[PDB]
Amino acid sequence: PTLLIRLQGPLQSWGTRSRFDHRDTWPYPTKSGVVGLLAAALGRDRREDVSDLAALRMGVRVDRKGVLKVDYKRYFLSDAAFLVGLEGERALLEALHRALKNPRFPLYLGRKSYVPSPPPYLPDGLVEAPLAEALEGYPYLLGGKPPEDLLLALEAEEGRLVYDQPAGPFSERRFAARFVREEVLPKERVPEGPP
């Protein structure tokens, strides 16, 4: 029902495309960034259609915000940890689940050489629940319970616009606006981690 992935590492960078400067970063993973990673895992050529991936409904749980720093110019998120969920058609999610375990192309957290640690694959990440519940109920990515309430950023029908919805093959760089709603997730909801 919902595929969960971990985006965690010493360095990450995420771009929207109301066109975005490659030297900037969004505060948490973007739909375009995540779909790019999914496509890499599947081994898709950049010219290939990604409408099936774009149709997935995405949510982000910010387990650890990480600190905004400069890489030498280039902004990045230091030591951030994100849980990302994707809800949609089962066969595709299962294919993605397998692809993430053994990615056909290297997975990077934004800029090539930002290596994930731990890897994005979560062995128990394919949850039979809709997006919000899947994200709410997954164990904290770091040890213990979250010490404070978490940010949850959900694809929605209303809210704030972000131009990160892949609307054609990545080679064309065609993106549309989607609404993302930011909510506060009570810390008591999240089971004790790590996964």
TrEMBL record:
Tagged with keyword Amino-acid biosynthesis: no
Gene Ontology terms describing biological process: defense response to virus; maintenance of CRISPR repeat elements
GO molecular function: RNA binding
Record InterPro entries: CRISPR-assoc_prot_Cas5, CRISPR-assoc_prot_Cas5_N, CRISPR-assoc_prot_CasD
CDD domains for this protein: Cas5_I-E
Keywords, alphabetical: Antiviral defense, Plasmid
NCBIfam families (alphabetical): casD_Cas5e, CRISPR_cas5
Name the record gives this protein: Type I-E CRISPR-associated protein Cas5/CasD
Organism annotation: Thermus thermophilus (strain ATCC 27634 / DSM 579 / HB8)
